[PDB]
Amino acid sequence: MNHYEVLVLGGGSGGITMAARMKRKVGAENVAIVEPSERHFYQPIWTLVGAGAKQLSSSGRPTASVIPSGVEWIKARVTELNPDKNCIHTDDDEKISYRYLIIALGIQLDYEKIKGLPEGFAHPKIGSNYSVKTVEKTWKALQDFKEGNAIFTFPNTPVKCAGAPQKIMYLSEAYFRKTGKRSKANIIFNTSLGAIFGVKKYADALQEIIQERNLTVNYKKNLIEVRADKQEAVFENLDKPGETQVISYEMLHVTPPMSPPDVLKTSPVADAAGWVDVDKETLQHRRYPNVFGIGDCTNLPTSKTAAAVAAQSGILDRTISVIMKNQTPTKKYDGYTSCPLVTGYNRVILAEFDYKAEPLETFPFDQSKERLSMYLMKADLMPFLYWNMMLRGYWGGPAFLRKLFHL
Template identity: 55%
Template sequence: MALLRKSFTQCISNRGLDRVLSQIRLNSSYEIVIAGGGSGGISVGARLSNALGSGKVAIIEPSDDHYYQPIWTLVGAGVKPMSSSRKAMKDVIPSKATWIKDSVAKLNPDEKSVTLSNGDTISYKYLVVAMGIQLHFDRIKGLPEAFETPGVCSNYSAATVGKTLKALKNFKEGNAIFTFPNTPIKCAGAPQKIMYLADEFFRKQGNRDKAHIYFNSAGAAIFAVKKYAEALNKIVASRDITANYGLNLVEVKPDKKQAIFAKMSNPEEKETFDYEMLHITPPMAAPAPIRDSPLSNEAGFVNVDSKTLQHTKYPEVFALGDCSSLPTSKTAAAVACQNKILATNLLSYRENQPRSATYDGYTSCPLITSSKTCIMAEFDYDLNPLETFPVNQAKERRTMYHVKATGLPIVYWNMMLKGRWGGPKFYRKLLHLGMSK
């Protein structure tokens, strides 16, 4: 026994505890492997591990921190502290799930395995892909270096969200430009939310009359859902904001404080804007291990059935959230519904039962229009409003702001991540006396 203890001690000192633990789990197998520890991975992991018990579910996630990213709009405007968006990953990993603190290097659906960045292989019976979406600041010439210069910021990254408030405070006069790229993005309303907060910030500073605010979007409209777009267009007009559509940011020249946009109608044709403040929403794409795997569709996202969230080719694979092919907005509210549906259908498939839970594309985008008001956009796959409250949610309301700023974070941390929140459908029916979907 003494010899064994000595050998083990030498092993730890020579290789390090992390290496020893890595060897212990080498080629290990779990019934369910979840790739990703964001909102989708943690919430569905909680449901599945609660249902199956300890040791059956593993979550692969390299990060030490877990962020509630929807609050970063308010963090960037100085309304909320950054600390309100963060918890340690160890505190949100479900207690009955195994945390594999590493990143996914390769997805091998034909072998029913996942290769980690350290070379280890994890086998599974069922796989849930919840790897989110990847930011690509590097696809814009001049970035990310331009973030080291005054006025350039982005609420989309923990590393850059703090620069937004600094840019707002340092703004004196000139152009404040807010961009929207030509790719799918998470929280499609966020690029304009910070714009409305900037408008309010400048008014409070007394220099709004010296600011020219531009919303330069590669898209064709302010918002995809007609009801909310009509309301937002009125807000843009009333606040003297210029919306330019069909413009995609392709280059930043920080030495000249210029932003170069390509026209979507003719990418060879460019338009240059001077800026004093430039808030960038970067191009985004599914992570490379997904794009390079047989699981992806032509656009690079995990190809799943839009109703059941089950892969169209590999029935033991499911996906949810930003990395999936689901044709709805990529928001935490969408994940809230998807995690319950996915868990229900995966467990049904495991028991050779029909996949009866269906997803209607419900998502929500709380469109903050000031530090006191919000338009609560809720809609389905067909871009039809699917509103929870029995009021016109296209109207700016203080109550909806408090739902967004205070209520939803509480639901997220205390219910959704613990597998106890599957979206507002029950409350929507209750508030509409059973007359809603």
Template identity: 55%
Template sequence: MKSFKVLVAGGGSGGCSVAAKFASLLPKGSVGIIESAEILFQTHYYQPMWTLVGGGMKSVKDSAKPMSEVLPKKAVWIKDSVASFKPKENTVSLSSGENVQYEYLVVALGIKLEYNRIKGLPEAFETPGVGSNYSTEYVDKTFQSLKDFKEGNAIFTFPNTPVKCAGAPQKIMYIADEYMRKHGVRDKANIYFNTSLGALFGVKKYADALWKIVEERKISVNLMHELVEVKPDTREAVFRLLNKPEETKTYKYSMLHITPPMGPPDAVKNSTDLCAESGYVDVDKYTLQHTRFSNIFGIGDCTNLPTSKTAAAIAAQGNILYQNMKCVMEKKSDSKEKYDGYTSCPLVTGYSKCVLAEFDYDGNPLETFPINQARESRLAFHMKKDIMPTLYWQLFLRGMWNGPRLTRKLLHLGMSK
């Protein structure tokens, strides 16, 4: 049986960055990373870029690098997938039937896209006008649908589940609005944001700014609308009204952007010792340590941390996890580092503007710059489009970017968290 000092389950953003931190600390071969060689054809994707791909500003290729280039060289790549966790035995079972033993475990398996929970999907993606920025299979269809749009309803959805990057469902809507204006078809379009949520955005400061934007652009927002079915033959989308669950409402569409329902990976959900009632990895919201197994930590979208699931959140979580897990490894009793729930959502509002939302567990803004980031900004847009991808590949995945906390303190003259 293979055995590792630190075993990382998952080679996404959280898994790569944390593995890099521990691989630089421990002797070569002490860290193992489980990531299937067949998933995504051995490719690691910078997924926050897919909003720009759907708007025609980037390509899928721009968001991709070979997995072999991003995993730390001193770590061992286990080219398999997790079947189940056995935390009482300190082992992970692989899909191949093998078991891997660990002394310390980091669970970083991300979140599962569940298009098939919507009746008519994924088959509807084979028809015109239907796309999704959440998958390499469908993101190019988003821009194609935008280019093909002539008139009618353009509908953008938000599911009734936790999602990664909760701002992305409406980012593409603002991009579509500007694209249609530039190409002279906006006056023939009805743009709808049909969201299962009861608010446009979860943090009031940014929600207030976004309400002004949708009102100025004459975008219709329908709250408590959950997409339950797509009928591609008649080009109709059926929504359940969550404040009247027995009722549905059907909309015709010319363009339909779908944000799929999401849920915990099967390997996590089916490992009852590991997960909370929600099916996500059950960790302490401040230390990221598992609530029942002291040698297990979790990071990112697969955990039950009550914050938005974003790459920015993972960057902030990474150093907290590293410091606290080091304390456990060194038999120190107290974990000094605490995660405050920091996350960021660069809300792209067009081809040159962005609202840069940053906030903590309590919905309090934690803004990096000493300006009002709820206002649309060209600087924030270019950070999103040009700076963040480089930061991601060169620093974040190498374990050298822990979020903007120190920068924020510096720019606010030490008067910020």
């Protein structure tokens, strides 16, 4: 069997980041990354791509260009995990064994669980910022919008970046005002959830925006079907089972249902729900002491964000080094996550919070305010630091900045 001291499953934000940190610890020849995609995406910018403010081409780089040099890139899909034998299977009919496994397989998008998708995306007026194949269709629908309902959905599943489904609603609202057709747009957010956001400080701030800008939110309302040829969408009422509503749209942004990656769903490393079953504080697997998880694929009970990945990557770096010494981990993940809620083409409400779902803001000022500074950070500083700092293992989230500020 081909063998690596440290085997990383997934070449996304978590997997590249952990690979760069592990390269420094065990040497690059002792690390391998399993990743099928030729391309690596900074997904946060898709929100601005869907709104016409950033180019899709700049959101991605070749996977080979972010593989830390000297690390082995195994271009394949993981098909099975056998942690009892310290090995995995890939779709090139090979088995790979490891001394330590880092699972960073992300979250899976399930558009086809919505009847009529993804085939409906072949028609006009419907987009989705969650897919490289559909984010530019969001922007086209926004551009070609003339009159009617502009509908934004939120599924009945876990999601990555819980705020992105409404960010693009605020961007669309601003676009209608900028282009003089706000009065022709009836803007509807149909969310499966019961609240606009999970942290009260920012939910309150978004609700004031919902009122001022005349937006409709229908709660516990889940998209179950698109008829793209007819510009109709069907929403089930999760409160009254069986009752469904058909409604026409001039623009539909679909947030797809999401789930653990198919290979993890049935795997021994998953919990009963299919997520990688890790310690909430150290990110070491609950049952396989040489396995670890980071990012969207884990059952860490916090928002699934790249910012959470960065904070986790700092903890997991420490966890692995002390597991390598047969010592007991002491540094603990606090659940840090961040959600830069884009509310317009030049404003962000920078939500930051931890496992307690309470504000944990980095800067000395009140981040529940719409801020230009926070927009420029999200739109222009964050991509640069992602490619040149986080992916190279030099970003563990802003806790040090927060402590350095409150000083």
